[PDB]
Amino acid sequence: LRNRVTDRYFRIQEVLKHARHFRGRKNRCYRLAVRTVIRAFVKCTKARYLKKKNMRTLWINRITAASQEHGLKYPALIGNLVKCQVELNRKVLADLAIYEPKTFKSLAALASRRRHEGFAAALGDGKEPEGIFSRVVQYH
Amino acid sequence: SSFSRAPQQWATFARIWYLLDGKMQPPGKLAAMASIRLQGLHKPVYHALSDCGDHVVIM
Amino acid sequence: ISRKWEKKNKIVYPPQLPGEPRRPAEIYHCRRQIKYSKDKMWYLAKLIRGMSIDQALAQLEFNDKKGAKIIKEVLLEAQDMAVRDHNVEFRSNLYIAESTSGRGQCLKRIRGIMEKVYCHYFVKLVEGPPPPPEPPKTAVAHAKEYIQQLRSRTIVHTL
RNA sequence: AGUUACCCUAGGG
RNA sequence: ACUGAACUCCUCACACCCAAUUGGACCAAUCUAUCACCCUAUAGAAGAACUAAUGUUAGUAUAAGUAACAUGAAAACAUUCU
RNA sequence: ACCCCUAUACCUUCUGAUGAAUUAACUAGAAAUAACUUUGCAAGGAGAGCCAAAGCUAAGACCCCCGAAACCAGACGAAGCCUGGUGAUAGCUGGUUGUCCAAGAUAGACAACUUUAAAUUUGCCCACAGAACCAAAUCCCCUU
């Protein structure tokens, strides 16, 4: 055999160091470990999308809870805060719900007032002065 | 605020006993509220692994 | 063939200070190449795993299994070397800290290959009364653990 | 050119 | 109205989701030339890299301590009995 | 740690059943004609022979593994069996071992598509006009 692989403990080790926390023979036997480690790596790569999606779902759940604490609904809160030029994202709104609940109540009241303004604007169609919180700051 | 760590934690994650009268009420509408509060989906602290459900008593 | 268990009796600890607890004696013994399966001798080894030497000897003298006599012989030898070689003043003041069985160099025979099974019995004795068994956890321990679990939870995935 | 219930081998349904 | 993608924007990074095939650049280990001198460099070479071939050999598992196997009786182990 | 959410083992073959207990070792691409690239020298190159209307000389870089029945020759036993021809041959499976970047899949009766490199100039999309007597559209096609 003119030349044969001397450095083969280390390739096996490269795969096996990622399988030490498995169950059964996957943590020891290279042939089974490789399959499971490949699958684990594909899962880890694909879980970044799911991480982001699930974070937004959690934020939306927590904001829904928080706004129902004040009688609002999540659509009302989000939409009517957007209409007040308040570009707060879902993440920050959920931290405000948990940690700064007076600021959240103020934001909920701001959303409610904008929503009532919208209802008044749509009810009395015509030329009537705009709602105070309906006014938009223009940029140029 | 200005609580100690242990009481703050205890206050945040304590479970509240809710009462719901079911007289003349549709069972599904009762069930919606009961399921929401039993899971703890009414709390901004909600996480699926936090074990933050509440007690619901339906009479 | 590895023979570490024999070497484990040649460790010389440094002499102690007067203000230091007395280091209990530690004795290691084994028998090699016993015509018995390690699987069968595992039961006899497990039976005596925290017993005093006297209790273990009593239990083994009344077991019908073949490995009982062999383990009894190993234990008696260990008790002798403990009192004589390892400065254990009382024969009674020993307990089986370790008692395992490993596989030996098994032979292969032609019938149709069949295995003539051998095994090793390993024991470690420690000077002193056997440690008391762990009491079964009460309802108070359970409740305390549950309350701690409840107290250790955090607001997940936020500031 | 027929034939093999003596058929044989690699495959396929 | 809201929810909803790897689409689009956003902060940064951008050569980094196609079979065979082809082209380019690296490259583990080995041997040689010259270096190097706790394990390397530039080159030349080659029996040069394996999660699979009802592959070959060796070790050890599973089935499994499973299937199965064996010694007529008492006794002084002389003997006698069935 | 588990509990929650997400997640139809892999390989091969189909347009999208096969094999594998596990570990260790072993185990599978061999041809420089032309062309291309890089040098040398140059109407000559080459250490005879060979080539030459820029050629010639040199180098580099392309062509796997396992798996019949048979037939023949000579023995050995009572057609069989063995050795040799023999790595026989033909079919049909199966297997063919590091990484990165670039390009890279559907007509058919050798062709089509595909890769690399090179030379040059239009390519695709298309408007009027234009294509037969006995519906969709298509061909052609300047602009853009």
- Nearest Cα to Cα of residue C25 among C93, C108, C127: C127
Contact B51 C153 (CB under 8 A): yes
Contact, B45 CB vs strand F, < 7 Å? no
| C28, β-bridge pairs | C124
Measured CA angle at C137 (ends C133, C142), to 5 deg:
160
Which residues fall within 8 angstroms of residue A86, CB to CB, at 6 or more apart?
A107, A110
Question: Which chain A residue is nearest to residue B37, measuring alpha carbons?
Answer: A65
Q: Is C159 on the interface with B (CB under 8 A)?
A: no
DSSP characters over C74-134: HHHHHHHHHHHTS----SSSEEEEEEEEEE---EEEE--EEEE--EEEEEEEEESSPPPPP
| Residues linked to residue C123 through DSSP beta bridges, in sequence order | C29, C99
Helix (H/G/I), strand (E/B), else coil: A128:
coil
Distance CA C1, CA C104 (A): 9
CA distance A59 to chain C (A): 9
Structural domains counted in chain A: 1
User: Which two structure tokens, joined as six digits, stand for C90?
Assistant: 């009382």
Per-residue tokens: C6: 């024999």
**How many residues appear in chain A?**
140
Q: What residues form DSSP beta bridges with A56?
A: none
**Tokens 């659509």 appear where?**
A75
- Whether CB of C102 is under 7 Å from strand E: the answer is no
Closest CA to C102 of C31, C10, C156: C31
Experimental technique for the deposited model: cryo-EM
Closest CA to A93 of B14, C159, B39: C159
Interface of A with B in 23-82 (CB under 8 A): 58, 61-66, 68-69
Residue A76 near residue A119, CB atoms below 8 Å: no
CA C23 to chain centre: 18
Look at B44 and A94 and tell me if their CB atoms are within 8 Å.
Answer: yes
For residues A102-135, one letter each, b for 16 or more C-beta atoms within 10 angstroms of the residue's C-beta and e for the rest, the string is eebeebbebbbbbbebbeeeeeeeeeeeebebee
Q: Are C93 and C54 in contact (CB under 8 A)?
A: no
The overall longest dimension of chain C from CA atoms, in Å, is 73
What's the angle, vertex CA A129, arms to CA A124 and CA A130, rounded to 5? 85
> In angstroms, rounded to a whole number, what is the distance separating the alpha carbons of residues C154 and C116?
59
Domain residues for the domain of A8 are: 1-140
Residues 6+ apart with CB under 8 A from A122: none
Closest CA to C100 of C34, C45, C36: C45
Can you tell me the distance from the alpha carbon of C25 to that of A116, in angstroms, rounded to the nearest whole number?
Answer: 85
DSSP SS3 for C28? strand
**By the 8 A CB rule, do C38 and C119 touch?**
yes
Please provide residue A29's backbone torsions phi and psi, each rounded to the nearest 5 degrees. -90, 125
To which CATH superfamily is domain C1-159 assigned? Ribosomal protein L22/L17 (3.90.470.10)
Q: Output the CA–CA distances (angstroms, integers) from residue C37 to C43, C65, C70, C104, C108, in the order listed.
A: 11, 12, 13, 9, 14
For residue C149, which amino acid is it?
Answer: Q
- Give me the DSSP letters along B9-55: HHHHHPPPEEEE--TT--HHHHHHHHHHHHHTTTSTT--TTS----E
CA distance C152 to C149: 5
Q: Which residues are CB-neighbours of C148 under 8 A, at least 6 positions away?
A: none
Cβ pair C155:B50 closer than 8 A = yes
Q: Distance (Å, rounded) from C-alpha B55 to C-alpha C80?
A: 66
* CA C28 – CA C34 distance, rounded (Å): 18
Chain E positions with any atom < 7 A from a protein CB? 1-6, 28-31, 46-51, 59-61, 65
* Strand F: positions under 7 A of a protein C-beta atom: 3-7, 9-10, 22-27
Tell the burial category of B53 from Cβ atoms under 10 Å away from its Cβ (0-12, 13-18, 19+): middle
